[PDB]
Design a protein around this ligand. Structure first.
Ligand code: FES
Lengths: 154, 195, 80, 76, 156, 142
């Protein structure tokens, strides 16, 4: 019947309207941050604290197997290829000995971590791959250029 | 990351496969479902959104499809409805009447809803009545959504007030059952969005 | 392309675009494709110079050019 | 080849099998470093056994994360 | 905004026009939210629309604009309506090398939801209860403020 | 192109498993066997060896070989030539600590198979896992 249909239309549910849409909302507060990733903090903290001077060089499209071979090669140089995912590298400065080394660790780059000032061994590592660019060496955890690294190394 | 869910506590009965349904044995379907409205063993099932008649072929379609696809190691299936008994004269076949909101098949085991969504939806499409695959979480959300819409309704006039108060003499043009349905059920069909 | 030269200063302000462009050029698959290329990276504003045998030299500075622009320009040149 | 349990348990029969390599006798347990016999001989380290702050813990957890994706992928 | 001059090429970063200071509603997540313009713009408001469109009439990326998706679809639809109505003479499509217009007359249109090219004619109009409906306007603009007694007839 | 095979050193011309598969890319089958025969003389004959042959587009051979498979040795150590149908729970041999460790010490000599880890925990897991793959249970003592 038509008359019954009229009753249904009037009884139709009416939804309320929010004052502001979620996208156009005023700035709301956000939950406090949580460190999930926490394991990786310990590994990077140990290696950087152990090694005062770090030579930062961009990583060419190297193979995983070569890195182990290069890791053994550095053992002859008394240096260690210890690397981890870099998306946890940036928060390293947030929770570590220093907070100001973020600009040095920009992008994906090979890190040569050595605790001793064996300049010749570090220079030899540079000689291994010329095409691979060495960003620089933070001798005594002080920011420096590649040319400066050699100058201070002298 | 967070720990992954586990189904170790779940136990699969030996009779993983569905049992056979016999070919052969008045408002049975024109009303709200009063039986098999609660999850018994499994966390997933099929919920009838309308009143339909399930013949032997439908049971075989459910039985054959479920048995072939289900994994006995991690899945089990049970029947939530009786065998067909209502004759359809040409008798060509017999059917099982179903009411709106009846759970027809319930499956459980060490599986997620998404794994069974595709098969259950395919079975639901092949069913003679409108149906929707349901789970314990999804079913509660439907009720929670149903409650939320009812609670926040802004309509000054409601179906119950007009019907119970006999305003306009509406009860003269309404059936006795309509009072119980409250506008959510019409004939053999159920209106989920009617709040 | 017989030679490709990429120069940038990491200690000073270093543009990501030029540095990222270096990675794409210095790839095991990219290098194999343009086998003729001799990959040389200069490490010390950034200037990228590519030399061709025909005499076409294309110089790209990443200070205001993204890696895509260099890649788009280089890709057409390589086809020749 | 050796066919004596005593020789099997007192001599390194399986250490070398070539003709250039002759079966060498077993030195005393103390003659080897402690870490040789302190190696993990138990079942594979489960999430409970693994230390939450160890790389193996997350490495195997990532392997488990692949399994669920593979399980979902297999069903497709 | 960077423009490239061109082989040796040089790219110069040039000054970009700045937004007028003191938005009416500061702290709005989107510029429309900032300017309280959620439901007060239409396709005829070319001045606002032109700012978010490429010089040749192409859509600018959402990320650069920073406005929310809801306004992005609304703005894009409004601009689409303006182009089909010939309301953007200076943002017309670029002719690639030497092409010229067909020179045939262009029919005057407005409130065009879809391109006239892909719409088939309606031979059978239908009776009173079977009448076919002709779309007018866009669904994206339903929420816009209405100054009429009854909601606008989307289908004519 | 790296192709991995486990063929035994004793037979240098298995046929289908090596000859045409390497030949399909285009290589000299006779040349492959001769170098493999050179490996056969150095190594004990009749023991499976993993190979890491690389077939370059230049139709050249880059043959690299390592230690004999510990998997077969575990099968030989357990006195098993053909294992059980499943081997997931079927077991015919038990290996003690001493036998496990002795082979591992020699194992750590090849640049291949990542046999450079200072801790021996990595080495034991592969052989322990290999035993799980085989129809062998590595019990501590029996
Ligand atoms: S008006 Fe605020 S997000 Fe659109």
């Amino acid at each position: 019947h038509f008359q019954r249909q009229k009753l249904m239309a009037i009884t139709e549910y009416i939804p309320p309207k929010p004052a502001i849409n979620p996208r156009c909302l005023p700035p709301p507060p956000k939950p406090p941050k949580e460190e999930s990733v926490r394991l990786l903090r310990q590994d990077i903290v140990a290696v950087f604290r152990d090694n005062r001077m770090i030579a930062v060089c961009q990583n060419v499209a190297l193979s995983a197997e070569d890195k182990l071979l290069l890791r053994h090669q550095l053992r002859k140089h008394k240096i260690f290829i210890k690397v981890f995912p870099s998306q946890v590298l940036k928060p390293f400065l947030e929770n570590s000995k220093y907070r100001n080394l973020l600009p040095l660790f920009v992008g994906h780059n090979l890190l040569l971590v050595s605790e001793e000032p064996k300049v010749k061994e570090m220079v030899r590592v540079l000689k291994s791959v010329p095409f691979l660019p060495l960003l620089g060496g933070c001798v005594d955890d002080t920011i420096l250029s590649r040319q400066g690294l050699v100058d201070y190394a002298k | 990351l967070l720990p992954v869910p586990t189904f170790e506590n779940v136990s699969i009965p030996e009779r993983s496969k569905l049992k056979f349904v016999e070919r052969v044995p008045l408002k049975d379907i024109r009303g709200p479902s009063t039986e098999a409205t609660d999850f018994t063993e499994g966390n997933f099932a099929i919920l009838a959104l309308g009143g339909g008649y399930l013949h032997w072929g439908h049971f075989e379609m459910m039985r054959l499809t479920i048995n072939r696809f289900m994994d006995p190691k991690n899945m089990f299936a049970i029947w939530r409805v009786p065998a067909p008994f209502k004759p359809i004269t040409r008798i060509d076949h017999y059917v099982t009447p179903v009411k709106t909101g009846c759970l027809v098949v319930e499956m459980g085991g060490r599986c997620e809803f998404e794994e069974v969504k595709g098969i259950l939806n395919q079975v639901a499409h092949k069913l003679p009545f409108p149906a929707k695959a349901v789970s314990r979480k999804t079913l509660e959300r439907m009720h929670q959504n149903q409650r939320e819409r009812e609670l926040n309704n802004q309509n000054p006039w409601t179906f119950e007030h007009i019907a119970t108060a006999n305003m306009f003499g509406i009860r003269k043009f309404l059936s006795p059952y309509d009072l119980t349905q409250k506008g959510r059920y019409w004939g053999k069909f159920y209106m989920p969005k009617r709040v | 392309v017989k030679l490709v030269r990429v120069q940038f200063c990491p200690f000073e302000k270093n543009v990501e675009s030029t540095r990222t462009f270096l990675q794409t050029v210095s790839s095991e698959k990219v290098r194999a494709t343009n086998l003729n290329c001799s990959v040389i990276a200069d490490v010390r504003e950034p200037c990228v110079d590519v030399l061709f045998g025909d005499g076409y030299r294309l110089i790209m500075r990443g200070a205001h050019l993204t890696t895509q622009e260099m890649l788009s320009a280089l890709a057409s040149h390589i086809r020749d | 080849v050796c066919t004596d349990p005593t020789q099997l348990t007192t001599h390194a029969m399986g250490v070398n099998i070539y003709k250039e390599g002759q079966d060498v006798a077993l030195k005393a347990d103390s003659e080897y470093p402690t870490w040789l016999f302190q190696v993990n001989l138990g079942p594979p380290k489960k999430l409970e056994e693994l230390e939450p702050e160890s790389r193996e813990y997350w490495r195997l957890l990532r392997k488990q994360n692949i399994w669920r994706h593979n399980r979902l992928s297999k069903n497709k | 905004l960077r423009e490239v001059v061109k082989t040796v090429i040089e790219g110069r970063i040039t000054e970009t026009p700045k937004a007028t200071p003191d938005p009416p509603n500061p702290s709005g997540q989107c510029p429309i939210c900032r300017w309280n313009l959620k439901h007060k713009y239409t396709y005829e408001d070319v001045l606002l629309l032109s700012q978010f469109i490429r010089p040749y009439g192409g859509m600018l990326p959402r990320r650069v604009t920073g406005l929310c998706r809801e306004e992005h679809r609304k703005i894009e639809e409004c601009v689409k309506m303006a182009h089909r109505a010939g309301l953007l003479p200076n943002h017309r499509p670029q002719l690639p090398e030497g092409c010229l217009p067909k020179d045939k007359p262009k029919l005057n249109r407005y409130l065009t939801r879809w391109a006239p090219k892909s719409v088939k004619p309606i031979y059978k109009k239908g009776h009173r209860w079977n009448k076919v409906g002709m779309a007018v306007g866009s669904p994206l603009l339903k929420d816009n403020v209405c100054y009429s007694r009854r909601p606008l007839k989307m289908m004519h | 192109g790296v192709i991995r095979s486990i063929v035994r050193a004793g037979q240098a011309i298995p046929g289908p498993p090596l000859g045409p598969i390497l030949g399909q890319r285009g290589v000299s089958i006779n040349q492959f066997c001769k170098e493999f025969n050179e490996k056969t003389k150095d190594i004990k004959e009749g023991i499976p060896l993993p190979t890491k042959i690389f077939i370059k587009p230049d139709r050249t051979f880059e043959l690299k070989i390592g230690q004999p498979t510990v998997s077969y040795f575990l099968k030989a150590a357990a006195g098993i030539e053909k294992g059980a149908r499943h081997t997931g729970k079927e077991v015919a041999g038990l290996v003690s600590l001493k036998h496990v460790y002795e082979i591992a010490c020699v194992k750590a000599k090849d640049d291949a198979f990542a046999m450079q880890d200072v801790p021996l925990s990595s080495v034991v897991r592969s052989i322990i896992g290999s035993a799980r793959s085989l129809g062998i249970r590595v019990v501590k003592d029996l």
